[PDB]
Scaffold this active site. Structure first.
Site, short mmCIF file in Angstrom:
data_model
loop_
_atom_site.label_atom_id
_atom_site.label_comp_id
_atom_site.label_asym_id
_atom_site.label_seq_id
_atom_site.Cartn_x
_atom_site.Cartn_y
_atom_site.Cartn_z
N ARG A 93 15.74 37.30 39.58
CA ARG A 93 17.02 37.52 40.25
C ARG A 93 16.89 38.75 41.13
O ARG A 93 16.44 39.80 40.68
CB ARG A 93 18.13 37.76 39.23
CG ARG A 93 18.76 36.49 38.71
CD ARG A 93 18.75 36.47 37.19
NE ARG A 93 19.54 35.35 36.68
CZ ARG A 93 20.85 35.25 36.82
NH1 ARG A 93 21.53 36.20 37.45
NH2 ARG A 93 21.49 34.19 36.33
N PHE B 27 42.35 52.97 32.40
CA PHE B 27 41.63 51.70 32.48
C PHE B 27 40.81 51.61 33.77
O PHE B 27 39.70 51.09 33.78
CB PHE B 27 42.62 50.52 32.42
CG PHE B 27 42.00 49.21 32.81
CD1 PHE B 27 41.23 48.48 31.91
CD2 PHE B 27 42.16 48.72 34.11
CE1 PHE B 27 40.61 47.28 32.30
CE2 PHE B 27 41.56 47.53 34.51
CZ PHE B 27 40.78 46.81 33.61
N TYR C 35 28.69 39.73 49.20
CA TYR C 35 28.46 39.16 47.87
C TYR C 35 29.13 40.04 46.80
O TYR C 35 29.69 39.52 45.83
CB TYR C 35 26.96 39.03 47.57
CG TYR C 35 26.69 38.48 46.18
CD1 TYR C 35 26.82 37.11 45.91
CD2 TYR C 35 26.36 39.33 45.12
CE1 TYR C 35 26.64 36.61 44.62
CE2 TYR C 35 26.17 38.84 43.83
CZ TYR C 35 26.32 37.49 43.58
OH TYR C 35 26.15 37.00 42.30
N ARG D 112 20.87 49.81 38.77
CA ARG D 112 20.38 50.09 37.42
C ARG D 112 19.59 48.93 36.81
O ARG D 112 18.60 49.15 36.12
CB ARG D 112 21.53 50.43 36.45
CG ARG D 112 21.08 50.68 34.98
CD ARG D 112 22.20 50.40 33.95
NE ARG D 112 22.71 49.03 34.07
CZ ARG D 112 23.90 48.63 33.62
NH1 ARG D 112 24.71 49.50 33.02
NH2 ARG D 112 24.31 47.37 33.81
C1 LIG Z 1 40.01 48.69 39.09
C2 LIG Z 1 39.44 48.11 40.39
C3 LIG Z 1 40.28 48.20 41.66
C4 LIG Z 1 38.22 47.54 40.49
C5 LIG Z 1 37.24 47.36 39.36
C6 LIG Z 1 36.46 46.09 39.58
C7 LIG Z 1 35.81 45.56 38.28
C8 LIG Z 1 36.47 45.85 36.93
C9 LIG Z 1 34.68 44.86 38.43
C10 LIG Z 1 33.85 44.23 37.33
C11 LIG Z 1 32.44 43.95 37.94
C12 LIG Z 1 31.23 44.20 37.07
C13 LIG Z 1 30.39 45.43 37.33
C14 LIG Z 1 30.98 43.28 36.06
C15 LIG Z 1 29.86 43.24 34.97
S1 LIG Z 1 30.54 42.58 33.38
P1 LIG Z 1 30.94 44.13 32.07
O1 LIG Z 1 31.83 45.19 32.77
O2 LIG Z 1 31.66 43.54 30.88
O3 LIG Z 1 29.61 44.77 31.27
P2 LIG Z 1 28.08 45.34 31.74
O4 LIG Z 1 28.07 45.66 33.29
O5 LIG Z 1 27.00 44.29 31.29
O6 LIG Z 1 27.74 46.68 31.02
MG LIG Z 2 26.22 36.49 38.74
#
Ligand SMILES: CC(C)=CCC/C(C)=C/CC/C(C)=C/CSP(=O)(O)OP(=O)(O)O
Ligand SMILES: [Mg+2]
Length: 341
Positions: free
Chosen positions: A195, A255, A136, A183
């Site tokens: 959830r 980044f 998932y 978290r």
């Molecule tokens: C660079 C690489 C190879 C992999 C990185 C993979 C990434 C960027 C995954 C994004 C997944 C997540 C944790 C999204 C939450 S939205 P959000 O980030 O906007 O905000 P929040 O978690 O609510 O604080």
């Molecule tokens: Mg979701």
């Protein structure tokens, strides 16, 4: 360019976190990544709206990627707040999309479809096993890692060799997703409906009812399970170190590094912390600024990860039923770090 502006504007409202980090990227890569994020964000909005029927989601999701080429498509009754707006005025995203390079469009369309179908799979079932947990995470985060890695290569900024084996890219996504799932336990279990992401395979060793962790009564078992979750996330760190160390471009590196360093800081804070079961544990705004400031090159990033990794380890005792499992995981991580110092 009003379309791009809306995109960056909705991005800022729909996700302040990513919207800051994304600014590290150069304009061309940034536009592609910003649009990529909004497309997936739209999918997420459909998957998470619990007030709308599942058959509606199993119907719409699989062909979400097809709408990328239909500048007139949009959705009216889904989501809350700005997310809702993202779908209703989804035209700006598809337009901006149509002005992207051919190679960027394909990566995005390709990841969009695979994530959507993965979400469909888990919309009709629970996360029972660790395998389920991992898969998932792959669909909703690991693939973002694949996508980004393919956008880096396609851009020329990184070497084509980067996309050879996407395992470490998947690890990068899993480390972030898992730290957030850990978290956000309380916040997630406190919603209607509740959830749940922690895998039964892991929590059934400490309780029969996950909701029991909300009671001080079972504080000991909640913490031991919380610690087992942390141990599970630590598996990905050596791989995050390898992926970050394989990057050559400074924009791509910052980044990519910042969210990882932030995840390790959060992880070090939630570990063995019973506050996790009644509130959101967060780093200080000062630590965040510091992380954003120094994660521009490998060496400094490695030392900050080492520092946080060492803080995590320092927070436990030989008494804990994890001390054993956590110790070798910490050593693997630190070892992987020193392996590049
Ligand atoms: C660079 C690489 C190879 C992999 C990185 C993979 C990434 C960027 C995954 C994004 C997944 C997540 C944790 C999204 C939450 S939205 P959000 O980030 O906007 O905000 P929040 O978690 O609510 O604080
Ligand atoms: Mg979701």
């Amino acid at each position: 360019d009003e379309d791009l502006r809306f995109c960056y504007d909705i991005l800022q409202a729909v996700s302040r976190s990513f919207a800051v980090v994304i600014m590290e990227l150069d304009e061309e890569m940034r536009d592609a990544v910003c649009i990529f994020y909004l497309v997936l964000r739209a999918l997420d909005t459909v998957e998470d709206d619990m007030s709308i029927p599942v058959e509606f989601k199993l119907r719409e999701l699989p062909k979400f990627h097809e709408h990328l080429h239909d500048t007139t498509w949009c959705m009216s009754g889904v989501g809350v707040g700005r997310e809702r707006e993202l779908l209703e005025r989804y035209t700006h995203v598809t337009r901006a999309y149509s002005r992207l390079g051919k190679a960027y469009q394909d990566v995005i369309s390709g990841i969009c479809e695979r994530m959507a179908n993965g979400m469909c799979d888990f919309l009709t079932r629970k996360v029972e096993t660790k395998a389920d947990y991992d898969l998932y995470c792959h669909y909703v985060a690991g693939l973002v890692g694949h996508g980004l890695t393919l956008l880096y290569v396609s851009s020329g900024l990184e070497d084509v060799r980067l996309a050879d084996d996407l395992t470490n890219a998947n690890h990068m996504g899993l480390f972030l997703q898992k730290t957030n799932i850990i978290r956000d336990f309380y916040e997630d279990i406190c919603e209607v409906p509740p959830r749940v992401f922690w895998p039964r395979e892991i929590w059934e060793k400490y309780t029969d009812d996950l909701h029991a962790f909300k009671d001080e009564l079972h504080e000991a078992k909640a913490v031991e399970c919380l610690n087992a979750m942390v141990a599970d996330a630590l598996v990905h760190v050596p791989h995050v170190v390898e992926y970050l160390a394989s990057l050559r471009d400074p924009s791509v590196f910052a980044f990519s590094a910042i969210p990882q360093v932030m995840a390790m800081a959060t992880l070090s804070l939630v570990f063995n912390n019973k506050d996790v079961f009644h509130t959101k544990v967060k780093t200080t705004r000062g630590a965040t600024a510091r992380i954003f400031h120094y994660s521009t090159e490998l060496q400094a990033t490695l030392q900050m990860l080492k520092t946080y990794t060492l803080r995590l380890a320092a927070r436990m005792n030989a008494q804990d039923a994890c001390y054993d499992r956590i110790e070798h995981l910490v050593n693997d991580a630190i070892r992987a770090m020193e392996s590049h110092q």
